[PDB]
Subunit: 216 residues, 4 copies
């Protein structure tokens, strides 16, 4: 139902401090090897007056390597698909809510995402564009009410050193009953590998591998 090589399209719209924007992306990768790559274009509201980094993790949870002994909640949701709902709380008080809807047509995945972010302070690092990508991260995942819940302590690298913290809570909602995983983790690295001067165009590479708890 999901082939070992897949493509995908991303339509993302939203607001940041009330500034509207649209993004489109084309991506590809190996759903079973955990790798993927995507090229995004700001099609409306560019150049963005805020850091691109807040949008990069919104742009492919089907592309996560599960070992055969951990039920892969999101792959099983197919072909009906799944949604996800996400809250990001930044340490200087900014909050975003983001939702995704994922569908499949052949060997193309389609993600529709809505992004709403606000209370980024005018002198903070998102609005001054002082961020330099995300540390690699590790999401704690567990099953509840037939849903998959993910908690991630994320951090943006800052220009001139140190970190700007963001907590992620992501709820994954299959459109049909599936076989629920036990308690586990997903390790990710997200990199911007190319971009133009004003981030109206961007390319990213992500690796994500699920695993059992490392110790015991």
């Amino acid at each position: 139902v999901i082939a070992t090589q897949m493509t995908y399209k991303v339509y993302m719209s939203g607001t940041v401090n009330g500034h509207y924007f649209e993004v489109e992306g084309d991506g590809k990768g190996r759903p079973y090897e955990g790798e993927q790559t995507v090229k995004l274009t700001v099609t409306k509201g560019g150049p963005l007056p805020f850091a691109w980094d807040i949008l990069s993790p919104q742009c492919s949870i089907p592309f996560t390597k599960y070992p055969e002994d951990i039920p892969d909640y999101v792959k099983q949701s197919f072909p009906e698909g799944f949604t996800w709902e996400r809250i990001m709380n930044f340490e200087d008080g900014a909050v975003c809510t983001v939702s995704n809807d994922s569908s499949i047509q052949g060997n193309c995945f389609t993600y529709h995402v809505k992004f709403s972010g606000l209370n980024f302070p005018p002198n903070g690092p998102v609005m001054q564009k002082k961020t330099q990508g995300w540390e690699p991260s590790s999401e704690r995942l567990f099953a509840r009410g037939g849903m998959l819940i993910g908690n991630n302590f994320m951090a943006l690298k800052l220009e001139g050193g140190g970190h700007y913290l963001c907590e992620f809570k992501t709820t994954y909602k299959a459109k049909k009953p599936v076989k629920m995983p036990g308690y586990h983790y997903v390790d990710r690295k997200l990199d911007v590998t190319n971009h133009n001067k004003d981030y109206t165009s961007v390319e990213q590479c992500e690796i994500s591998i699920a695993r059992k708890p490392v110790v015991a």
Copy 2:
């Protein structure tokens, strides 16, 4: 610049658990007496599969009675106007982010609002439609960085008694420097005074009066 009787139009769109909707409203009242009334129509995505109450407070901060001894931040923002950015955190984990943009053309105010709400649990009171309006509330307001910040502990009455708590944080952003108020409160009552069977149409009445701290 603001007459003692004013009308207004509301265009509100957004998502709740990823369900898209549009609302339009026509309202009127006495900006200096703190009273106002509005009739709303769900123009898209109706009937809504969630409680209307989560949307009612999104639908007119110009209509707040200030005593002459408290600078009225929002009226002064006119005619350039103002925006506001709002986070609502519900005690069962749901969060919404909402932004408004307010403009003026003659004696009509126009509010454009975007609403993004999610992680309302499927058996909770918003999705089961068990709520029965908001308690009257009192918002703590103070000045910082040229902005007005409002904190409100809100509560929805529940069918069969008790309360469902929601915290509001609202940041009001004038589009030009204005004269900043000191520390103060705004008391509100919001009532649904008419509606049809499925809340595709709704009418509301609100009173809001600013005051100094009651004791000392």
Copy 3:
């Protein structure tokens, strides 16, 4: 059971960033008029290396004026008494947990309080002693599981202007079933009216009056 003039004793111990301290106080006032006054001494761990203001609201909920039409949960708890449990979350990340136990012997109230506060940053206003008393405040109060729950958005005035925000959540637990109040507010002003140079001795005056919602 509670006379119209009452005295009280306060024994408070705790830690702030791990620094242990003990306070004792002697207080008096009119439980039915909402007024009271208390003199506190730092009996151990003085002079304190942090702002006294974080301790001032820990030092008499029996002394709150209720109108006859609002059940007074805390007075009814007597003579068995009551406890309260409190969480304070400061906007720069510091948190305290505080519990009180209140007993009565004749016309003396006795409050035993434990205070635990930490993650006050070393350059923040509590540890640099930059605070200048609390704004007057207004606590939203409601009944649940036979308990009284109070939510308060508090603010400390800062040296050189502006505010340092603290959210209070206080749960009041009668030691026997009592008649539960409806949804209401309590307005307070707390003032330090005298002190010595290093706040090893302090005197405070508080007024608190319960009321119904002001508007509607």
Copy 4:
């Protein structure tokens, strides 16, 4: 300064919903291999009317295996030592604040800990004793202001399945400047390996290993 085999003593006192308790413990292990074991006795306030599990993670951060390429902030703090300050936020609203002070005398470590926990609801799993140990966990660690900050999404297993979530924030404060680590993780498993009927006596085994991010 720290030998490859070490012993330790724990004195812990505190309150839970205002119930006072004291614990003492004797422990031993291999500070460089990440292993350790400890036997605890409730010396005052036993039997405890709440789940022991809330106390088990308070009872040895010197015993963490660092690879040679990650500065070990806590070992370097010796012999002056270190403190830590911790906030635990449980998903049903309970909060604890905990502080530790660690000293060294020869080849014995001494931990003094204070524990303050409250708003555990009377029918929740801590007060009904429905918990069954902690999932293995993984703490995100980073340097800021000369301090080490740790964020952990923890979970208690429940009787009859599912999880009760607790977020940990722990700040580690060396008593002298040390060489600061980069961004890293510590994986732990904490097990109760023996206990008597009412948890007045308890034995625990913990493994903790620091590592770099797994992916990239």
